[PDB]
Amino acid sequence: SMCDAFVGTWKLVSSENFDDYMKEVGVGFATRKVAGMAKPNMIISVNGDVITIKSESTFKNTEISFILGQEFDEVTADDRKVKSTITLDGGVLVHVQKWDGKSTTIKRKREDDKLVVECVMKGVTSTRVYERA
Ligand SMILES: O=C(O)c1ccccc1-c1c2ccc(=O)cc-2oc2cc(O)ccc12
Ligand SMILES: O=C(O)c1ccccc1-c1c2ccc(=O)cc-2oc2cc(O)ccc12
């Protein structure tokens, strides 16, 4: 399917304005500095209708499994317990995280041989680029 373009192993190669985006999300100082340093590997896989996104770094190891359009519980190292929904909108994986009446969007798009990640929170944008690993 269309998810196959996202499937594979990805390595973080560039990050821009991630600290200012995490500040705007409400991420604490210690967690921002820890997350800001990490150069994660990201494994995106598909099994039936279930999408798995595994991240691996010196900071942590995370795993989320989900069905497109089906809301799920996601864990974060901040004062936020989030309800997330991931949908596929015209080739773009749109990840909406909602907590305490607020929301942030993480968009992933395929550009050349890269996975371009756009994170938006109340006008503050961070761009992160991954390459195939
Ligand atoms: O994938 C990202 O780069 C990302 C962008 C905005 C907010 C969080 C992340 C992020 C993750 C988002 C979803 C997920 O399933 C796993 C993530 O893992 C990350 C690991 C990091 O070191 C650092 C960042 C992440
Ligand atoms: O919140 C975390 O556990 C975390 C810790 C280290 C590196 C990245 C994250 C991180 C996420 C990790 C996994 C995940 O599924 C979602 C994450 O979302 C984040 C969002 C932030 O604003 C800021 C950070 C994250």
User: Could you state, in order of their start, the residue ranges of all structural domains in the chain?
Assistant: 1-133
Instruction: Indicate the CATH number of 1-133 among 3.40.50.300, 1.10.3720.10, 3.30.470.20, 2.40.128.20.
Output: 2.40.128.20
CA of 27 to the centre of ligand 2 (A): 9
Residue 32 CB coordination number (10 Å): 19
Q: What are phi and psi of 40, to 5 degrees?
A: -70, 155
Question: Atom of ligand 1 at shortest distance to CA of 40?
Answer: 22
Question: Which ligand sits closest to the CA of 35?
Answer: 2
Rounded Cα distance between 80 and 73, Å, is 11
Burial 74-103 (b: 16+ CB within 10 A, else e): bebebebebebbbebeeeebbbbbebeeeb
CA-to-CA separations, 51 to 15, 44, 94, 104, 108, in angstroms, rounded: 24, 7, 13, 20, 14
Q: Which of 102, 98, 108 is nearest to 74 (CA)?
A: 98
**CB distance 44 to 7 below 8 Å:** yes
Rounded Cα distance between 54 and 56, Å, is 7
Residue 130 CB coordination number (10 Å): 23
**CB distance 66 to 72 below 8 Å:** yes
59 lines ligand 1 (CB under 6 A): yes
**CB distance 96 to 103 below 8 Å:** yes
Question: Atom of ligand 1 at shortest distance to CA of 12?
Answer: 3
